[PDB]
Symmetry: C3
C-alpha cells in the first residue's frame, strides 16, 4: 500500500488518490516564481534564483549621448546600452529606461553608478525615477572619487501601462559635461 | 514495486517504507523560509519569495512631524506611516521604527529616501540605526537633487528583546526645516 | 496502480517507470543553488536562502591599519577583519578584499559603511572595486553624519582567476586621518 499524512507540509505529493479511484496518481513538481525544478533522471532538483534582472554598461559607444550636458538631468535612452547580464524577460531596456512587464509588480533593487575620470570637480547629480516618485543624490567629486552612485530598494507598482511601468535614469555633473564616462545600471526584482 | 536511490538529493520522498512496515508512506512537501508550495491538484508548485519586507511612504499626512527641524536628527515615529507594501509579519512599523520579530536575525536590505522640492540648499543628512551600530550619509542639495538617499545591506542580530530589535530612522537638511517632504523607507530580509 | 500526468510541472517525481521495467522508481528531491531540502521524517522541507554572503566589521582591532591616512585610498587588507556573519564558502575574506570562488559569477549586493565620530569635517571618500570597474562616492561630513556609506548591486564576472575575482575595498576622509573608525563591509550573492 501507499501514502502518509504529516500535519505541516502539503500536496501529499501523491495525493489525488481521489478523482480516478483505484488509481494512485502522484502529482508532479513545478517551479513557480524564482524557482527551477530541473529533471535529472535520478531526482528532480529544486533550484532558486530571481525572476528578473538587467545589468547595463552605458557609455558613448553603447547607446549613450556623445556628451552628458553639464548641470541638468535628461532621462537616458537605454535602448542601445550594453546588456552585461540579464535574467528573465521582466526587465527590458527601452528608449525611456528599463521597462517592467505586466504582473511584475514587486520590490526592486536598483543601482546606477558613474565614473568619468577626467572630471573631478563639482558634484555628480544622480537620478532614478518611477511613476510619480523620483529618487536623488548628489556626489561630491575629486580625482579620488571622480564619479557617483545611487542604490535603491523600492516597491514598483506595475499598472500594466507600458509607458508608466518604466524606470527612467539620469545623471550628470553640476559644473562640467561628461564625455569620457562609464555608466552602469542594474535592476533586480527580488520579490 | 516502488522507490529508487540517487546519491545526491534527499528524503527519497516516499521514504519511510520503514516505521510502518508493509506500508510505503511517501512523505509530503512543505515550504520553509522563503518558499511556498501551492497545491494545484495536478501538481504541487514550489514558489520562492522573501520572508519579510515592509515599504513605507512617510509624509506630513501619514504619521510624520509637521516639520522636520533643521540641522538635527530625531528618530522617526513610523507607527502612523503608510504601508505601501509588506510581506510577512517579521517587519512591522512601530513608534521607534521598524521592529524585527524573534528568530528573525539575518541580513537586511534597507533603503530610506527623501524628496523635499522646496529646499534645494545645504546637505540632506540621513541616518539608519540598529543596536549600537548607526549608519550615515550626507547628500548635497540643489534644485535638481532636492533630496537624499541611504541604501544599506546589513546584518541584524535579533536578540529577541523587542526594544533593541528595531531599525530606527532619521533625516533632515543641515540648514532648513522640511515640511513639504515625501519620505520612503523600505526594509527587506533576504536571508 | 500509480502515476499521473500534469502539463506544467516536471520530473513526474516518480518518473523512471522506465529504465528498470516492472519497477516504479520515484525520484528523490535535491536542493540546488539557494535551496535546502531538509528531511523531516514526516515530509521533506524545501527552504530557500542565498548561496553566499560575508559580513565584516573592520576596525583597528580586527585587522585594520592603526590609522587610515588622510586624503588617499589604499585597498584594505581584510584577512584579519571580523566575520560578523557569513553564508556558504563562495565569499571569503583575504588580504586583497573578499574573494569570489570559481563558478560564482553572478549578481552581488554590496555595502561598505564607515563611522569615525572624532572626524566630522571634509568629505568621506569611499571605494569598492572589481576587475577593471571601480565604484565611488563622496560623503560630506559633520558631527551628525560623521561617516559614509556606499551600497552597490553589481554583476561580477568570475573568470576563475583567484586574484582578479576579488572585491577590493577602500575609504578615508579627504582632510584628516581615521584612527577611531568602525567599518562594515557586507557582500551577498543574490543570483
Amino acid at each position: 500500500v501507499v501514502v502518509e499524512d504529516s500535519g505541516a507540509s502539503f500536496g501529499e505529493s501523491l495525493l489525488d488518490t481521489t478523482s480516478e479511484p483505484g488509481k494512485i496518481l502522484v502529482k508532479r513538481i513545478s517551479g513557480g516564481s524564482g524557482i527551477t525544478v530541473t529533471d535529472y533522471g535520478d531526482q528532480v532538483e529544486i533550484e532558486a534564483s530571481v525572476t528578473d534582472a538587467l545589468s547595463l554598461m552605458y557609455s558613448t559607444s553603447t547607446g549613450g549621448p556623445a556628451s552628458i550636458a553639464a548641470n541638468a538631468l535628461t532621462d537616458f535612452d537605454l535602448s542601445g546600452a550594453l546588456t552585461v547580464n540579464s535574467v528573465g524577460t521582466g526587465l527590458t531596456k527601452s528608449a525611456a529606461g528599463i521597462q517592467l512587464a505586466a504582473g511584475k509588480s514587486g520590490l526592486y533593487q536598483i543601482t546606477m553608478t558613474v565614473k568619468n575620470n577626467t572630471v573631478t570637480t563639482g558634484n555628480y547629480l544622480l537620478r532614478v525615477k518611477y511613476g510619480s516618485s523620483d529618487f536623488v543624490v548628489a556626489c561630491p567629486a575629486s580625482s579620488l572619487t571622480a564619479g557617483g552612485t545611487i542604490s535603491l530598494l523600492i516597491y514598483c507598482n506595475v499598472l500594466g501601462v507600458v509607458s508608466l511601468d518604466v524606470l527612467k535614469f539620469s545623471l550628470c555633473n553640476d559644473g562640467a559635461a561628461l564625455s569620457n564616462y562609464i555608466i552602469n545600471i542594474t535592476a533586480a526584482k527580488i520579490n
